Amino acid sequence: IHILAFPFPAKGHINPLLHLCNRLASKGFKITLITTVSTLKSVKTSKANGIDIESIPDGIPQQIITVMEMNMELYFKQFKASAIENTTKLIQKLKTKNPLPKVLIYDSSMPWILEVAHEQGLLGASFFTQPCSVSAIYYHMLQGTIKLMVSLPYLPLLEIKDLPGVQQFEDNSEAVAELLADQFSNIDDVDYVLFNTFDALEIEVVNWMGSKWPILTVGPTAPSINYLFETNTEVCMKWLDQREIDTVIYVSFGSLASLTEEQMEQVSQALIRSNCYFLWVVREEEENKLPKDFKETTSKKKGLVINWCPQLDVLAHKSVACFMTHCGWNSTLEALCSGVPMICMPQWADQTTNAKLIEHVWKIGVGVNKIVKREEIEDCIRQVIESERGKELKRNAIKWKELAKEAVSEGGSSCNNIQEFSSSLL
Numbered sequence: 001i002h003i004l005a006f007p008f009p010a011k012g013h014i015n016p017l018l019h020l021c022n023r024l025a026s027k028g029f030k031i032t033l034i035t036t037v038s039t040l041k042s043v044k045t046s047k048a049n050g051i052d053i054e055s056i057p058d059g060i061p062q063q064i065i066t067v068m069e070m071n072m073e074l075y076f077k078q079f080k081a082s083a084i085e086n087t088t089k090l091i092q093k094l095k096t097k098n099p100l101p102k103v104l105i106y107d108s109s110m111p112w113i114l115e116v117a118h119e120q121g122l123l124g125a126s127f128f129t130q131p132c133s134v135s136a137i138y139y140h141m142l143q144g145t146i147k148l149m150v151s152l153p154y155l156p157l158l159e160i161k162d163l164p165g166v167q168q169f170e171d172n173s174e175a176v177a178e179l180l181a182d183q184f185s186n187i188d189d190v191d192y193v194l195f196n197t198f199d200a201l202e203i204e205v206v207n208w209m210g211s212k213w214p215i216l217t218v219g220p221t222a223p224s225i226n227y228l229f230e231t232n233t234e235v236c237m238k239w240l241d242q243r244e245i246d247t248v249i250y251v252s253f254g255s256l257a258s259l260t261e262e263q264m265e266q267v268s269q270a271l272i273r274s275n276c277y278f279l280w281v282v283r284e285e286e287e288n289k290l291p292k293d294f295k296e297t298t299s300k301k302k303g304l305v306i307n308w309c310p311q312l313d314v315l316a317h318k319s320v321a322c323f324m325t326h327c328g329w330n331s332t333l334e335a336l337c338s339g340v341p342m343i344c345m346p347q348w349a350d351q352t353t354n355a356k357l358i359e360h361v362w363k364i365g366v367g368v369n370k371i372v373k374r375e376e377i378e379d380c381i382r383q384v385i386e387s388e389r390g391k392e393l394k395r396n397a398i399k400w401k402e403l404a405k406e407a408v409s410e411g412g413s414s415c416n417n418i419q420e421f422s423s424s425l426l
């Protein structure tokens with residue numbers, strides 16, 4: 001059986017779908033991953049995956065998300081129109097080859113790909129890369145129950161700052177809010193609704209959505225073949241192997257978020273004076289905002305500054321004591337499933353809500369208070385590395401790690417749901 005997979009062209013959307021594809025290929029399915037030209041330019045390793053990679057045009061002018069940032073309203077619709085045309089053309093080509101495609105798993109943020117799947121005679125599966133708790137907000141947004149203290153069914157009481165952040169996007173704010181709510185615009189017509197979460201993590205909201213539509217919780221999809229992009233694996237893991245247990249702060253703001261030069265100074269000085277060992281991912285295009293001699297010498301005593309790391313392998317390493325994170329869902333879930341407590345500095349979109357869930361529901365991290373000054377960051381490091389509170393957060397993270405292991409092992413909710421999905425296709 002031949003499965004097609006089409007993530008949104010950003011790493012936090014590609015990676016969790018890639019991990020699901022790797023699981024499905026292990027069960028015997030043929031996988032074709034559909035990527036933009038822009039994404040393929042960053043792909044460095046793929047041979048070991050055995051997955052076919054097929055590229056489509058970017059569909060907007062010539063990094064594709066940085067062109068999209070210039071005018072989200074216009075360029076997301078241009079990307080949509082081009083994606084519809086070019087995925088149609090690609091499927092038409094794939095229909096001249098055996099085995100014929102049978103299902104298209106597509107990013108939930110591109111709900112209009114469902115029309116392409118059905119027009120081509122394929123089943124359509126929408127893949128949600130955010131937790132059900134956050135996705136629920138987007139549904140209520142579409143229904144008009146909420147726009148842009150807040151009570152919503154089966155969610156903790158939220159402060160305004162805890163709702164998904166779109167005001168940060170300025171003139172793009174309206175376009176981004178529309179994109180998020182539209183994830184539910186055709187949910188009744190989707191053949192399969194997949195969420196990268198596990199039931200025990202959000203019992204009540206999963207049960208609530210399950211009462212409206214049959215949904216399949218299949219997360220964590222995360223488990224070499226684990227990475228498509230350059231991860232600097234040998235440098236990172238040789239350095240971690242030199243650190244004792246529970247001594248390293250891992251720091252990453254993901255694949256998209258950019259901090260101002262003012263904000264990165266506060267992070268830099270906070271890390272130096274904590275006198276903690278640290279591994280800080282600073283993307284190549286963001287290095288020029290680091291203080292003068294930070295990467296070259298003053299970080300050399302206690303730190304590793306790297307433009308990308310193998311995040312799954314880093315979070316699994318016993319040396320890592322905590323994870324200073326922007327709270328994107330992959331990072332949150334990967335830390336939770338690795339037993340690693342967090343320092344939350346959310347930037348925008350669902351990160352704000354994820355940070356609330358981390359601190360107050362799952363209780364595996366602490367939040368910083370706003371610019372975030374270095375003094376606040378060092379305080380949070382002390383709470384997690386030294387204080388009794390940090391030992392509680394660590395124990396809580398280990399309990400969630402155990403429940404996530406249960407979910408993906410035989411008999412667990414996510415294993416059962418991936419089995420149900422696989423069997424449905426046969």
Ligand SMILES: C[C@]12CC[C@H](O)C[C@H]1CC[C@@H]1[C@@H]2CC[C@]2(C)[C@@H](C3=CC(=O)OC3)CC[C@]12O
Binds near residue numbers: 066130176
């Ligand atoms: C506005 C934004 C801000 C961050 C970067 O500057 C990139 C731009 C354009 C791309 C845009 C992000 C803001 C976040 C996004 C809506 C993000 C998504 C979040 C989601 O749930 O579905 C898509 C992917 C990337 C995104 O489409």
Ligand SMILES: O=c1ccn([C@@H]2O[C@H](COP(=O)(O)OP(=O)(O)O)[C@@H](O)[C@H]2O)c(=O)[nH]1
Binds near residue numbers: 015308
């Ligand atoms: O040095 C890094 C930093 C991040 N990641 C991966 O990049 C994705 C980050 O996604 P997330 O949802 O956390 O945030 P986003 O980048 O979408 O804002 C995840 O797959 C991380 O595992 C990584 O492999 N190496």
